[PDB]
Ligand SMILES: N=C(N)c1ccc(OCCCCCOc2ccc(C(=N)N)cc2)cc1
Ligand SMILES: N=C(N)c1ccc(OCCCCCOc2ccc(C(=N)N)cc2)cc1
């Protein structure tokens with residue numbers, strides 16, 4: 261598999277790693293999203309310690325108002341992170 | 352870096368790998384997009400041999416009508432591929 265192909269599978273695997281822990285096994289509830297950010301985005305994003313802060317991130321990500329981040333919503337989150345990283349390192 | 356963090360950087364690196372070859376160094380023209388698909392998505396997508404087929408893929412990806420795929424448009428392409436892969440392997 262190419263690097264791109266392995267990257268794609270890694271996105272799928274991290275989503276399932278955290279989504280399957282509680283409740284709906286195919287969505288990230290706020291608790292699962294906080295764990296994902298703190299354990300997997302520790303170089304890209306500030307650690308979340310407050311309920312207020314994960315509330316706000318979930319508000320941004322949650323396009324259908326169910327209080328959770330589904331796989332489509334997670335893909336939008338990945339696009340946001342990737343865009344911000346790409347731009348951080350360039351002029 | 353986590354797996355997710357390395358995956359994010361891999362998306363950036365494959366985009367730059369192909370975008371920088373010709374013309375606008377920050378967009379994939381059809382020629383660059385064809386090369387990316389054929390060399391980097393050979394397990395996920397059918398090889399492109401015809402101008403018609405890359406025309407069609409570029410039509411799908413090109414949201415601002417400039418005939419090219421910018422980084423935002425490429426992120427949408429990555430979301431499409433990842434979604435299709437995730438769903439292929441599940442019930
Ligand atoms: N010392 C580093 N940060 C760094 C190290 C290696 C690297 O290998 C290719 C990745 C793309 C290289 C140029 O574009 C970016 C954009 C964003 C990030 C990032 N989100 N960290 C990293 C690189 C890149 C950056
Ligand atoms: N050898 C080592 N130990 C080492 C080498 C490079 C390194 O680099 C740290 C992070 C570099 C890239 C990630 O940093 C950001 C920060 C903010 C944003 C943002 N704008 N959201 C995106 C990415 C760290 C450790």
Ligand SMILES: N=C(N)c1ccc(OCCCCCOc2ccc(C(=N)N)cc2)cc1
Pocket residue numbers: 269270272273436437438440
């Ligand atoms: N034999 C395989 N295909 C395969 C091998 C390893 C693997 O490691 C974790 C990746 C996620 C595992 C379960 O979800 C998916 C969804 C899509 C793909 C794919 N796009 N190929 C692969 C896996 C996964 C699949």
Ligand SMILES: N=C(N)c1ccc(OCCCCCOc2ccc(C(=N)N)cc2)cc1
Pocket residue numbers: 394395435436439
């Ligand atoms: N040991 C080996 N040599 C080997 C092991 C597994 C393998 O698996 C091939 C591809 C598996 C996952 C990629 O296959 C697709 C197909 C269609 C879609 C789609 N719906 N677009 C998405 C993914 C290949 C070789």
Ligand SMILES: [Ca+2]
Pocket residue numbers: 278279280281282283284285286287288289292
């Ligand atoms: Ca869950």
Ligand SMILES: [Ca+2]
Pocket residue numbers: 321322323324325326327328329330333
């Ligand atoms: Ca939702």
Ligand SMILES: [Ca+2]
Pocket residue numbers: 369370371372373374375376377378379380383
């Ligand atoms: Ca180009």
Ligand SMILES: [Ca+2]
Pocket residue numbers: 412413414415416417418419420421424
């Ligand atoms: Ca465009």
Ligand SMILES: [Zn+2]
Pocket residue numbers: 346350367377
């Ligand atoms: Zn760039």
Ligand SMILES: [Zn+2]
Pocket residue numbers: 276286437441
């Ligand atoms: Zn799944």
